[PDB]
Design a protein around this ligand. Structure first.
Ligand code: ZH1
Ligand code: CA
Ligand code: CL
Length: 158
């Protein structure tokens, strides 16, 4: 089992880290949601789908930068919603193909009432997401760590 990002980088068998740069919504109001769909960005595959089932969970989601200060969020993992920054680990999605498929996570962030001006800054770290891979074959328990960066400023009008 390995993963890749849409821009290039790969995390190989056994785990690692990688950076993911994402465009964010330029303007979001109090009462609106910023959606950050990471499933257009991170993809994974099973290296032996013919006997092995890989189980993948979102083990941890943390917020950094402006997301941490200025937003409150939920994370949607494979169609279900949990608070964000995460307070538990998610259920498991299955991987059973050798074709890369999205890791189905999206963040939903809405600005807190005190937010105004530039609420997220271009180039900055906004989240660290940990993907955890295990299987029905051995004791492998691996961490794929995704460091998420903003490509642009996000403004909360005021
Ligand atoms: C045609 O023959 C094959 O393709 C073939 C034939 C023999 C062995 C294997 C094999 C076994 C374990 C293995 O281990 C890696 O891949 C597993 C499946 O993703 C994960 O469960 C693990 O954690 C680890 O990443 C990767 C590949 C593949
Ligand atoms: Ca491979
Ligand atoms: Cl890959």
């Amino acid at each position: 089992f390995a993963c890749k990002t849409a821009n290039g980088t790969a995390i190989p068998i056994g785990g690692g880290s990688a950076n993911v740069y994402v465009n964010l919504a330029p303007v979001v109001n109090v009462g609106q949601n910023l959606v950050v769909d990471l499933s257009t960005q991170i993809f994974c595959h099973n290296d032996y789908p013919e006997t092995i089932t890989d189980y993948v969970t979102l083990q941890r989601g943390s917020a950094y930068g402006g997301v941490l200060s200025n937003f409150s969020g939920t994370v949607k993992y494979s169609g279900s919603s949990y608070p964000f920054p995460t307070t538990s680990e998610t259920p498991r999605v299955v991987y059973n193909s050798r074709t890369d498929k999205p890791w189905p996570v999206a963040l939903y962030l809405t600005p807190v009432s005190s937010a105004g001006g530039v609420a997220i800054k271009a180039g900055s770290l906004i989240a660290v997401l940990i993907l955890r891979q295990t299987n029905n074959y051995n004791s492998d328990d691996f961490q794929f760590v995704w460091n998420i960066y903003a490509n642009n400023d996000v403004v909360v009008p005021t």
